[PDB]
Symmetry: C3
Subunit: 499 residues, 3 copies
């Protein structure tokens, strides 16, 4: 029983909540976690792609092998000493961290805000005892290099060339069970009522599985280009994304900047929308009066925070804060996806809308919160409708074989991808007249502009769904698509006249 | 007599400066303020649009009605207690504010920089006495929820369902007369010599009136989309825009981030230009060594500020700092507007240029300030000329009925909008071949690129008027317009040959 | 002998390292510096352009003349007094600076991190003695207005109208020899093995010479527009760019924001790529825990910095930090330039790659550093190849005289520029069908999108080379170019049929 983890997760793992020991609970999670039938490995399109050099870091459990360069057999203290010279900043950053400073956590004053960590330390120690990693009357001396890079509570020497590993999600989970299980519970909680999306997605628990299952990613020859997508989809394999390497600060992952590198760009510009909104701007202007060290639960009180942030909003469900960020997903970013809009009035959605009001009501009035969320929905449907109008046109042009080069110069897409109209692959692969200008236009209208229109609406950024983003760009796309349709229509007329 | 308010304002209101009491002065302002003949209400196109749920917040004086949900009759202390649970962050933010902490303002040390507030407190108290809101031998205990949300200095109980209101500009004005009048004086000060713009615009005093008077806004069916424009045009109705809700910090409104959400984007990117300039970058790098609590008047001395900011530059006229931001407007953002360029050499403009040098000369040499402002002007005329060349072309294409679908598929715009070439409505409404690709191109060249070219020039951002913005994009527009004109010209040739 | 300056520089100047006195060393540098045969003056295209008002500031040694406005003969103390009123912020900013506070530097504690400055003070004093600017038993009282704006260690009165100057690089060099020589050594160190770029470029030592030698800059009539390019190319003439005017803070130039105004935009978005990367985001989140006052050499230790920055990475060579930023340049930003890609596997490049690993290895493992730099290269070649495919097409269209208006409406470029296909001038000059839409497309594909693809790769920003920038935009360009080629191909078919 790890209170914050959903029953559903316990059930799926076949575990009895009030009976499962930490060892058992952990064993189950890792079972499913390292199982290829659940998303582990190279995927279904494995025969089409090969890993590049940096891939041993993006997916360790599949590609990482120890660096045979230095033939060294070292101990706990050797790792630090040698690396003081070899990787200077890596040793310093670690030493200045809680992993290297466990004593502080123990001698914490009860009236200190960061006191909750002392409890978290006890918990960890009990997880390790249950797993036989720690003796019953033994404390965790520290969390050093040898612990994460070879074995937890490793005493004896480690062979550098045959023992070094890269810490994956489950490695942290040996101690951070509560966090690991909460994230893994996403596979169980994000399940759509009509299969609009794959069970347990979109999420952080299956983001790498989602990346390797993207046909284009597996078929395109430009592995270096394609790899830039892998970097935004590593959360599943390693836990150093929000709270970065060696320092692993929780205060850092609470700041909006932590999500920014991944949650930005054309098909979703969460970072840009948020930073431009009042919430976001106030977060910039008041970041200095806020105590980011205080956990999310006490942020709006002891933390002094008076403006929402990415984590505050997305990691909160019904007053509880967890590592599972799926529980409130209604639009899953892309409004054009089948059965999404259609599902927006389901009791399923209604119940999640209620959860979102519960989040806005910590500050605003419910009447106010409901007034805006309603606009968010109807506004997304207005941008959606515009896309469908333009799409209706270009789609028939396809049905009629009238797209430029459709009959002549439209080379087939790379295997295992099959030909079609308006496919994602067209956003990353082009050859001759595949895709055709008008096709790419109607495509980017939905995948980029319509997507950004929603993001702007969801993140209270006026110009983000009006002039600057969304409507403005979409208005242009529709106009140009129209303007092209008519030109082609007049060209064909003259064509027939001649023949 | 409120020293900072222009004579013109007194005259227009029919008030004798050295005779008008605060009560009288206030009564006049609100008269014009709530008068539909001056911009209040739904406007001239009221029969075409209806307010949406969130509209009761954007325009309270027209749409707001108390939330009948909770049937409660409360007192001053009840508002706070109940809301401690109901709207947690709203109560905390207020308690931590000067409105909730009036005593501090009174016990202020004379040598303290924030001492001027003590005087501002006395003034307010006198405004209230004159209006019978405060007794002659009585102090303002505090500015709590019941004061702003029902009645100023309200003693007895308030009926939640029938008494609650949303504080509009005039509500703050009951106490903050000096600020209210300074902003309202914009109606009187921003008057152009040749009607290039509507009297009292562009400004914050008539920004909502300007929004509802935008035909497209009133005619377009997408009310949710259209509402994102209302959010950038609320300054007229409420004063919580620069210094946000419940905390109402003056230090906050002095920081560039406060203007950012509205003053950014395609048709004007003041935020982006500024942040990228040296002034702006230095403002980011030195924001921590600056005391933002110090009023604008003492910023460059006691505040330690050594780089200009949005407020420092725009709220300063001739050494004085006011809430009226119109007094120095020469180009009103859009250089293509009729008689603007043409007016750039008028004694009117000359005199405002002198006012701007007076602002730059607090730091730079006049010779230096004049060297750049001159470049700003000639540079804007060079971008303007480029637009006019491309415009000359597409305009004739219109005169000759040769725009794509002009004769056939060019549906009429929504009422009360009338058909035409290159209308603003084309930036927010499209149907078939209205507008036509080339039309939208020549349109966005002026409304977006040319506009941004100027903004870049005015806010010392090199790449903002050269490569990245302005010239670069405009060079492309001209090229593509040209390239299309010739193609259509050759297509018609072959047309005639066949018939 | 100034240890940090390359032998090559000594050799080129004809100086004997262990014999050249500071006076001699300085005399040599300035010789070449003020010599038109090396980049000084108006350049080879001088007869085509004239300086505008603000040009006296961008290139003082060529255009600046004292302001005859005020007829004043002043002394050291007069400059300050009068300017206290005339240029308020200019006097304050200076007074609060080290130039105005030399005593502090002298009484510095040895255990203080900013102690190294005391040594730098001694050095300067010795430079001045050697140049007869300072007496043997004399200290530098201070660095005030009269020193920089008339003469170093000036005693007597200065005539405002005939004596005032604008401090150029060599002016600072009278005291800051070490810094001046390090920057000038760029002319000697950035020399490519196959003339891919002009000797000593790209760099800061010859950035103005590079600007005036840009044909378009000299030929285009829009001097105000063209001047926005001069502002990003002033480093050669003045040293107030990274560490700005009057305060001249070294802590300021160490912060990423200092490079941002110039190193951003379409043809290179270093600022945007960096700020979005983990390195950059961590730099934003941890800028407050870092001591920017500590010199680069001690940043990663005493400074507490645990994330790289623009200066840390670019000013470091082999453990040493200098003002010369050329020593590690492999791709010089634009991958499409002839013989660049081709040179990427030369021992020259290999040796610079090794230098870059030496920089990444202060934190990451070499295996890790090498894994990413490899991806950076192969990834840039994949974006390059895509450009070449599209280019191959449009180029033949040129060879065949089939570009829109190529035979008819393609006006010649302004002198001294000669006609051609895909020239830089086409990015800043357009007339009729010159350039042609397809030409501008293939052009911006390389100069903007391909360039940004690389920058994204070099600055670890995933979306910067995938969706948002690079690949995404380039995929569109290729598609649209293709889509146009086919349309023109079918149009000509029907053409022949008619005739
Ligand atoms: C970081 C800047 C990203 C890059 C580069 C790529 N993706 Fe992406 N992707 C990103 C985010 C933040 C999200 C979530 C968006 C949301 O709000 O839902 C996504 C989403 C996807 C998904 C969809 C969900 C699912 O099917 O499970 C997939 C399949 C996906 N991304 C794959 C993918 C591929 C293969 C890319 C390059 C070829 C690509 N993404 C780039 C952020 C980033
Ligand atoms: C916030 C990001 C905005 C959105 C969304 C919209 N507008 Fe706007 N508008 C904005 C600013 C900051 C300004 C001032 C620009 C300047 O420098 O002058 C404007 C200006 C206008 C005006 C012009 C002045 C006048 O006629 O009085 C009008 C009429 C106006 N804006 C209306 C309007 C409408 C109706 C919009 C959507 C359909 C729209 N704006 C969006 C900022 C923002
Ligand atoms: C600041 C925002 C710039 C503006 C405006 C212009 N240029 Fe530029 N340019 C800029 C940078 C940061 C760089 C270096 C890019 C890199 O990573 O290498 C450049 C480079 C050039 C060069 C190339 C190198 C050389 O030939 O020596 C030249 C010739 C150059 N820039 C000239 C130039 C001209 C004339 C411009 C306007 C007409 C232009 N640049 C604008 C930044 C900026
Ligand atoms: C796996 C690479 C891993 C991650 C990720 C991780 C994260 C993490 C965070 C964010 C903190 C907070 C630090 C702060 O002060 O803000 C933290 C703290 C503790 N960790 Fe950890 N940690 C990772 C791995 C491990 C492993 C393998 C162990 C067990 C040997 C472990 C233990 C602890 C303990 C104990 C603490 C301190 C108490 C607490 O703050 O919870 N971590 N870790
Ligand atoms: C920062 C603390 C942060 C937040 C907040 C956040 C949110 C978020 C949500 C709400 C989702 C759910 C999917 C949906 O749209 O319904 C989600 C999904 C993905 N995220 Fe995320 N995310 C934050 C941080 C991070 C970081 C640091 C990265 C990049 C390494 C990242 C990436 C992604 C990706 C990719 C998805 C994948 C969805 C899928 O394909 O199944 N997130 N995130
Ligand atoms: C990977 C499954 C993973 C682990 C494990 C992990 C651990 C971890 C710990 C131990 C803490 C507690 C530290 C403390 O003392 O407060 C913690 C806190 C936060 N994390 Fe985490 N975390 C993992 C992954 C991720 C990812 C991918 C994100 C970003 C979407 C993320 C974010 C956060 C945040 C926010 C906190 C603070 C939460 C709070 O209630 O204050 N973590 N993490
Ligand atoms: C209307 C919603 C309203 C606004 C807006 C507003 C703003 C405002 C600011 C910016 C301050 C400064 C706070 C700081 O410390 O920086 C401030 C201060 C005072 N106010 Fe106020 N205020 C609004 C409404 C009202 C009303 C209705 C009253 C009168 C009952 C009132 C009074 C005061 C007083 C007094 C002060 C303190 C002294 C001062 O700083 O001027 N406010 N307010
Ligand atoms: C931040 C303190 C801030 C500044 C500075 C500022 C300036 C500004 C100017 C100079 C104008 C005058 C119009 C002109 O271009 O000549 C103006 C006009 C508008 N503003 Fe503004 N503004 C600042 C803040 C705010 C905020 C917070 C918003 C958004 C709610 C905002 C909005 C607008 C709008 C809209 C106009 C309207 C002009 C009209 O239509 O008549 N401003 N602003
Ligand atoms: C709406 C008409 C409105 C009112 C009323 C108002 C009040 C207000 C007060 C009382 C202050 C003084 C607080 C103090 O103690 O210093 C004050 C100060 C500033 N305001 Fe304001 N304000 C109103 C509206 C707006 C708007 C729309 C803006 C942004 C364009 C704005 C900005 C500012 C700024 C800046 C300050 C500080 C000015 C200074 O001289 O320091 N206000 N406001
Ligand atoms: C030329 C306009 C010029 C520049 C540029 C410049 C820069 C510079 C910096 C960045 C500092 C550091 C200040 C800090 O505390 O971070 C600095 C310091 C000193 N300078 Fe200087 N300086 C310029 C010009 C001159 C001239 C003409 C002299 C000689 C009369 C001079 C001297 C000094 C001295 C001495 C110091 C203090 C010691 C040190 O930090 O090196 N400077 N300057
Ligand atoms: C900030 C400390 C900063 C850094 C870092 C930086 C880097 C940089 C490099 C690596 C080059 C070399 C050229 C190449 O790409 O190989 C370079 C060149 C130029 N820079 Fe720079 N630069 C920084 C700061 C500044 C500043 C503040 C400006 C703008 C006034 C600026 C400008 C330029 C320009 C222009 C070039 C010219 C190259 C040429 O044409 O020869 N840099 N910079
Ligand atoms: C122009 C040739 C120029 C001079 C001269 C100059 C001087 C200068 C000094 C005296 C210092 C030392 C100050 C101290 O006490 O630490 C110094 C330091 C830095 N500078 Fe510089 N500088 C000149 C030009 C430039 C330019 C164009 C840049 C930006 C690319 C730049 C940057 C820096 C940085 C960074 C530092 C700190 C270096 C460190 O090792 O800490 N300078 N400069």
């Amino acid at each position: 029983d790890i209170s914050t983890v959903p029953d559903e997760t316990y059930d799926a793992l076949k575990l009895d909540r009030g009976k499962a020991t930490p060892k058992e609970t952990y064993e189950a999670l890792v079972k499913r976690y390292k199982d290829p039938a659940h998303g582990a490995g190279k995927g279904t399109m494995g025969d089409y792609w090969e890993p590049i050099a940096i891939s041993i870091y993006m997916d360790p459990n599949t590609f990482y092998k120890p660096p045979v360069s230095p033939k060294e057999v070292a101990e706990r203290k050797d790792c630090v000493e040698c690396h003081s010279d070899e990787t200077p900043v890596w040793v310093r950053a670690w030493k200045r961290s809680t992993h290297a400073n466990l004593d502080k956590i123990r001698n914490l004053k009860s009236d200190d805000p960061l006191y909750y960590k002392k409890g978290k330390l006890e918990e960890v120690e009990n997880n390790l005892r249950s797993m036989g990693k720690l003796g019953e009357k033994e404390t965790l001396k520290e969390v050093g290099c040898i612990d994460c890079h070879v074995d937890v509570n490793k005493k004896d020497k480690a062979d550098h060339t045959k023992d070094i590993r890269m810490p994956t999600a489950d490695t942290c989970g040996t101690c951070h069970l509560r966090e690991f299980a909460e994230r893994e519970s996403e596979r169980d909680t994000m399940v759509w009522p009509n299969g609009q999306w794959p069970a347990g997605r979109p999420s952080h628990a299956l983001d790498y599985t989602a990346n390797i299952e993207t046909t284009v990613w597996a078929t395109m020859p430009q592995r270096e280009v394609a790899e830039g997508c892998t970097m935004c989809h590593t959360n599943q394999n390693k836990c150093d994304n929000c709270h970065t390497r060696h320092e692993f600060s929780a205060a850092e992952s609470r700041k909006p900047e932590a999500c920014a590198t991944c949650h930005s760009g054309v098909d979703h510009n969460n970072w840009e929308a948020y930073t431009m909104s009042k919430h976001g701007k106030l977060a910039e202007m008041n970041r200095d009066k806020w105590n980011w060290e205080v956990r999310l639960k006490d942020a709006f009180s002891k933390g002094g925070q008076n403006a929402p942030t990415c984590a505050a909003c997305h990691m909160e469900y019904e007053g509880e804060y967890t590592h599972n960020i799926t529980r409130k997903t209604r639009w899953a970013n892309y409004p054009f996806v089948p059965g999404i809009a259609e599902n927006i009035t389901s009791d399923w959605s209604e119940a999640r809308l209620d959860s979102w009001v519960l989040t806005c009501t910590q500050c605003h009035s419910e009447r106010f919160a409901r007034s805006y969320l309603d606009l968010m929905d109807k506004g997304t449907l207005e941008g959606l409708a515009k896309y469908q109008e333009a799409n209706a046109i270009v789609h028939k042009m396809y049905e009629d074989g009238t797209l430029t080069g459709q009959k002549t110069n439209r080379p087939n897409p790379p295997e295992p991808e099959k030909p079609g109209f308006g496919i994602f692959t067209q956003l990353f692969w082009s050859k001759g007249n595949n895709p055709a200008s008008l096709e790419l236009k109607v495509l980017e209208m939905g995948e980029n502009n319509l997507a950004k229109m929603h993001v702007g609406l969801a993140h209270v950024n006026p110009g983000g769904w009006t002039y600057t983003e969304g409507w403005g760009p979409m208005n242009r796309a529709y106009v140009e698509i129209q303007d092209e349709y008519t030109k082609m229509q007049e060209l064909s007329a003259l064509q027939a006249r001649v023949n």
